[PDB]
C-alpha cells in the first residue's frame, strides 16, 4: 500500500468499534480528508482479526460510487490502519438531528435509489453486506449516500451454503434469519433496505424488537403471521413453532400511511416473507417509484 502515517494529521475522533477507533484525518500532501480506522494487532493474540481480513479483501474489489472507498491499508507489526474516503455524516444522525419535520420524498427516493445501486453492485460481486442499517450508511455534502462498515460482510458462493446465524442488527434482521433457516441469501440485504426505506419516511424503526421472538412478533403483527400459502416451507423452518399467534396481515397503507401507491408497492416487495419472491436490488432500480429520481 502506498501510504504512511507521517503524511496524515489526525483531526478528531469520529467513531469507535470492537477492534479500534476511527479518526477524521487530513493528508498533508494532497489535502484529502480521510477516515482512519485503527485496528490494534498488538492487543490481539489471534493475529489479524477475521472481520478486518474480510473488510479489506472485499472492499478492495468493490469500487462503486455508492460504496465507501478503502483508499489504503498501512500494515505495521502492531497496528493496522484502514484509510477510508471521509463522509461527514450517517443517515441515522441525519434523521435525528435534522430530519425533525421529515426527509423530503425527493431525497428519500434519491437515497434509496443510490442504496440499491450500491447493494446491486455488492450482490453482482458475490458480497453480502449483512449489517445494513442507517448508522452504516454515510452521506456527504453533495447528496451521495454510501454503504459502509463491511466487517460483518461475506463472500458467497452460488448456491449459498450455511453461513453465520448471528447476522444483521436485530431491528433490520430478516424473518428467514429469525426462523433459523439453514440458508440465507441476497434477500437479507433487501429486507434491511426495506426496513430502512420505511424508517426514512417515519424517522422511526419499523420493527423495534427487544429479542428475537419479540422481533418476529412485531413483524408478524405488521405483515401478518406467515403460512404455507404466503411462504411455502415456513412451517418447516427450525425455529418455526405452531403455537405462534396467527395475526392478520394489515393493509399496507396502514403500515406507512404517508407513502404513495408506488412507494407502498416497492416496500411491500422489499418486505415479502418468501425470500424467493422478495425483490432484488437490480429489479428494484426499475420500479416506478423512482421514475422522477434526481
Amino acid at each position: 500500500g502506498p501510504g504512511s502515517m507521517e503524511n496524515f494529521q489526525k483531526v478528531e475522533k469520529i467513531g469507535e468499534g470492537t477492534y479500534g477507533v476511527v479518526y477524521k484525518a487530513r493528508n498533508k500532501l494532497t489535502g484529502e480528508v480521510v477516515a482512519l480506522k485503527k485496528i490494534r494487532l498488538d492487543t490481539e493474540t489471534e493475529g489479524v482479526p477475521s472481520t478486518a481480513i474480510r473488510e479489506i479483501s472485499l472492499l478492495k474489489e468493490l469500487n462503486h460510487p455508492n460504496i465507501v472507498k478503502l483508499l489504503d491499508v498501512i500494515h505495521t507489526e502492531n497496528k493496522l490502519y484502514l484509510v477510508f474516503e471521509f463522509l461527514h455524516q450517517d443517515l441515522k444522525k441525519f434523521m435525528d438531528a435534522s430530519a425533525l419535520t421529515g426527509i423530503p420524498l425527493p431525497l428519500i427516493k434519491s437515497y434509496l435509489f443510490q442504496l440499491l445501486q450500491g447493494l446491486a453492485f455488492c450482490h453482482s460481486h458475490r458480497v453480502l453486506h449483512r449489517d445494513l442499517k442507517p448508522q452504516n450508511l454515510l452521506i456527504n455534502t453533495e447528496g451521495a449516500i454510501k454503504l459502509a462498515d463491511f466487517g460483518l460482510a461475506r463472500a458467497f458462493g452460488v448456491p449459498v451454503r450455511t453461513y453465520t446465524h448471528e447476522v444483521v442488527t436485530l431491528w433490520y434482521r430478516a424473518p428467514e434469519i429469525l426462523l433459523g433457516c439453514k440458508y440465507y441469501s441476497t434477500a437479507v440485504d433487501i429486507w434491511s433496505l426495506g426496513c430502512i426505506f420505511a424508517e426514512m419516511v417515519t424517522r422511526r424503526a419499523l420493527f423495534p424488537g427487544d429479542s428475537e421472538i419479540d422481533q418476529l412478533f412485531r413483524i408478524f403483527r405488521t405483515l401478518g403471521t406467515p403460512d404455507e400459502v404466503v411462504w411455502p416451507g415456513v412451517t418447516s423452518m427450525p425455529d418455526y413453532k405452531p403455537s405462534f399467534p396467527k395475526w392478520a396481515r394489515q393493509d399496507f397503507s396502514k403500515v406507512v400511511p404517508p407513502l404513495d401507491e408506488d412507494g407502498r408497492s416497492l416496500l411491500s416487495q422489499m418486505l415479502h416473507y418468501d425470500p424467493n419472491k422478495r425483490i432484488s436490488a437490480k429489479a428494484a432500480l426499475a420500479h416506478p417509484f423512482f421514475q422522477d429520481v434526481t
Binding site: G47, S50, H125, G157, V158, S185
Partner: protein, 262 residues
C-alpha cells in the same frame, strides 16, 4: 430461487472469470524455487487435506489455502524447512476468511507438532497478507463446480461428490494443474464425473454459460483422466481416504472409466 442468486449468477460467473486470471499463480514457479519441488508441495497439500478433515473445515477453505500458497511461492523463495509454516499461515488465513468457526491459532501451532511457534505462525500470516496484498477473495474450483452443478438434469449427489473429489486431486499436483484455471479444471472435473456416473457429457447449457467445449477442455480432461486412473497409486492418499466417507457418497470407491471416447 434466491439461494441460487438468479438475478446475479451471471454477473458473478463473469466476475469470477476475471478474478481467476488476476489470482493466477505463475505456472513455472517450482523450477525457480531452489529448495522445494512439486513433490514437497504435494506432501504439504495432502497434509492440509488431513488438517481440513481433522478440524471439519469446508472444502472451500482447503482450496483457498492452496491458492494462497501457490501465489506466495510464485514470488517468495522458501527453504524446505519453512514450507509447512507458509502452508499453516495459509490455512489460518483461509479459515478466518471462509469459516464460521475458524480453529484458534493455537490449534494451528498444535498441528505442526511444535515445529513452529505461535509467534512464527502470526508473523508468517502478516507476511502472506503483505505478499498477497489482502487479495484473499480468490475464485476456486469449488466456486465454479457448485454453479455447474445447477445444470444437471436432474441433480445427482454422486456426480457432485465425484466432481468435488477430482477437483481436489488436482490441488495435489502442480504439474500439470498449475497451467489450468479453476474454471477449466472444474469443467473437466464436472464432465468426467458426469460421464463416469451417468454416461452423460458436458451440457450445451454450460457451453452457453462458459463458452467452453469438449474441444477446449480436452487437454485438462486427458490429464484429469490420467490422474483419476493413477489415483490408487499416487504417493498421496488423504483425498481418496476422505472421499471414502459417506459424507461424500464414498465416491473414491467408484471405478474410473477406461476411455473417454473424446
Amino acid at each position: 430461487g434466491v439461494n441460487e442468486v438468479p438475478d446475479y449468477h451471471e454477473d458473478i460467473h463473469t466476475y469470477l472469470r476475471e478474478m481467476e486470471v488476476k489470482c493466477k499463480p505463475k505456472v513455472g514457479y517450482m523450477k525457480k524455487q531452489p529448495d522445494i519441488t512439486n513433490s514437497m508441495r504435494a506432501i504439504l497439500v495432502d497434509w492440509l487435506v488431513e488438517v481440513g478433515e481433522e478440524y471439519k473445515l469446508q472444502n472451500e477453505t482447503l482450496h483457498l489455502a492452496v491458492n494462497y500458497i501457490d501465489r506466495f511461492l510464485s514470488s517468495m523463495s522458501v527453504l524446505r524447512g519453512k514450507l509447512q509454516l507458509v502452508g499453516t499461515a495459509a490455512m489460518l488465513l483461509a479459515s478466518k476468511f471462509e469459516e464460521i468457526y475458524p480453529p484458534e491459532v493455537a490449534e494451528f501451532v498444535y498441528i505442526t507438532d511444535d515445529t513452529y511457534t505461535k509467534k512464527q505462525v502470526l508473523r508468517m500470516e502478516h507476511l502472506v497478507l503483505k505478499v498477497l496484498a489482502f487479495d484473499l477473495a480468490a475464485p476456486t474450483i469449488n466456486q465454479f463446480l457448485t454453479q455447474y452443478f445447477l445444470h444437471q438434469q436432474p441433480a445427482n449427489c454422486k456426480v457432485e461428490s465425484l466432481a468435488m473429489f477430482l477437483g481436489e486431486l488436482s490441488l495435489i499436483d502442480a504439474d500439470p494443474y498449475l497451467k489450468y484455471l479453476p474454471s477449466v479444471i472444474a469443467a473437466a472435473a464436472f464432465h468426467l464425473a458426469l460421464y463416469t456416473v451417468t454416461g452423460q457429457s458436458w451440457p450445451e447449457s454450460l457451453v452457453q454459460k462458459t463458452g467452453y467445449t469438449l474441444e477446449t477442455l480436452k487437454p485438462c480432461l486427458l490429464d484429469l483422466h490420467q490422474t483419476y486412473l493413477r489415483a490408487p497409486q499416487h504417493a498421496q492418499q488423504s483425498i481418496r481416504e476422505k472421499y471414502k466417507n459417506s459424507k461424500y457418497h464414498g465416491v473414491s470407491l467408484l471405478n474410473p472409466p477406461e476411455t473417454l471416447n473424446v
